[PDB]
């Protein structure tokens, strides 16, 4: 008015740009991005370990493999398949047949606000068991590292190593809940929600930032290996973001019509 929008930059216009009237008071500030995200949110559920664990393979895997799937949770908002970083997001709608269903995940409601390209925070790990009268134990190792899996016998009882180690553990109470905040540990600089690139120099799938992540939480009961029940059980995991920053804005997920 009478400016043209083809210069790429237009400002806003209050009521007295062309009409008679005065501008209105600012209402609130539930808008700042280091307050908006700070909400306790679960991403998924977890099958509980009870033995010597084994972790899934690299990208192709023929049948006859022996891994214990759906026991880890590579906690990121980024889409994840079988507890290792994927690039797309599945929803297994017609699950009849043979061959095991992979553990998918994604942080659903994060993208519907996300108009960003780069992100920066710290997080916290909140765990809760769904089955009653249960007592468990959560473990963790940082990004760019990998789980230790073996067992050493004590007085005829086979006990695995993930009771001990360097990286922290946590033992819950009688049906309690464990929570702690966890800082940055990534080799790269800021978390990407978009990426070009590839993992190695050549002959790699183009798009997955394999070492710009957080880490993973696994749950296990404090019992020796030979005293394990036949009923399997479950537990969920929750994340709340903290002290966040953001850079160089972008689009939003496309809404249906449909």
């Amino acid at each position: 008015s009478t400016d043209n929008a083809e210069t790429g930059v237009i400002e806003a216009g209050n009521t007295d740009t062309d009409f008679s009237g005065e501008l209105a008071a600012p209402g609130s500030n539930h808008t700042n991005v280091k307050f908006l995200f700070d909400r306790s949110r679960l991403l998924n559920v977890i099958k509980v370990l009870e033995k010597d664990a084994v972790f899934p393979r690299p990208f192709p895997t023929q049948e006859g493999a022996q891994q214990d799937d759906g026991y880890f949770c590579l906690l990121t908002p980024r889409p994840t398949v079988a507890s290792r970083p994927a690039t797309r997001f599945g929803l297994y709608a017609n699950p009849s047949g043979s061959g095991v269903l992979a553990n998918t995940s994604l942080d659903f409601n994060f993208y519907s606000l996300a108009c960003f390209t780069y992100f920066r925070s710290d997080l916290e790990v909140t765990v809760v068991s769904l089955e009653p009268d249960l007592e468990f134990a959560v473990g963790w190792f940082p990004s760019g590292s990998e789980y230790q899996a073996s067992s050493f016998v004590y007085d005829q009882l086979h006990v695995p190593f993930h009771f001990t180690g360097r990286t922290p553990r946590a033992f819950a109470s009688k049906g309690g809940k464990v929570s702690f905040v966890l800082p940055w540990n990534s080799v790269s600089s800021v978390l990407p929600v978009r990426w070009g690139g590839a993992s190695k120099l050549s002959s790699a799938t183009r798009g997955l930032p394999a070492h710009a992540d957080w880490g993973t939480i696994y749950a296990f009961v404090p019992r020796p290996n030979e005293k394990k029940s036949t009923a399997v059980k479950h537990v969920a995991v929750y994340i709340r973001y903290k002290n966040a920053r953001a850079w160089c804005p972008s689009m939003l997920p496309f809404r249906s019509y449909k």
């Binding site: 083809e6 049948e63 297994y92 061959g99 790269s188 183009r206």
Partner: protein, 268 residues
Amino acid sequence: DRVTTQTAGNTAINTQSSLGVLCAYVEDPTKSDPPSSSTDQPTTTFTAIDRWYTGRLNSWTKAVKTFSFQAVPLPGAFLSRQGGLNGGAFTATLHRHFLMKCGWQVQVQCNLTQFHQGALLVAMVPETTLDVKPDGKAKSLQELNEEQWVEMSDDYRTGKNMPFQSLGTYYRPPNWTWGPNFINPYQVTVFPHQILNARTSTSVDINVPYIGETPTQSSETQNSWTLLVMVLVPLDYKEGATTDPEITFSVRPTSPYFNGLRNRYTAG
């Protein structure tokens, strides 16, 4: 007014009916510093490469549809040499430095008459992969002339056209729906951009400094600033007007940052 003679190195481009500039996120974008992660002495700028390279893009007709775009990556354009556009000395340099870091001037090209209408949209999106359909092979210079435009399907809208990986035959074959990389065409004007049409302008510019996920990405794998041109309203012209106008572009690096000598790159 409206006459901008921009001179760099030994080349000098002017577009007599232009509009201005458009920086991003900082009013003077050329300022930077050598990256903190390195330890070697970085090879800074030199006047033999401070240049507008230009290169021809595909032409455009009546037969296009709405939201159909071309998109050229960067600096991956310089590698595969689209449209008669090569870095020349610049590619011979950045083949031999494992770390590369630079910001970009762009001004794009058209000139429609005064009896036309139809709006393009020049914009450079950050950090996208709009050059591959999921086979795993990046598309090259032969398969550009069979389409002249990317007909904007729903599979880019729902993020279904990003390269996935080999699932492994121990599992079930999946049912994918979403990826975090996508294009939402009702939304694409949140990036540095300006409407180019036969209304006022002929050629028009963007400008952008660096963004990155790390202080310095790799040499020949990263692509931050893909630039895409897309049509919002198609052209109409009577019999006698100039059929199928032509599009080229003009790309300038500003303050390059090289690091790490070795042999010239040979792909494994």
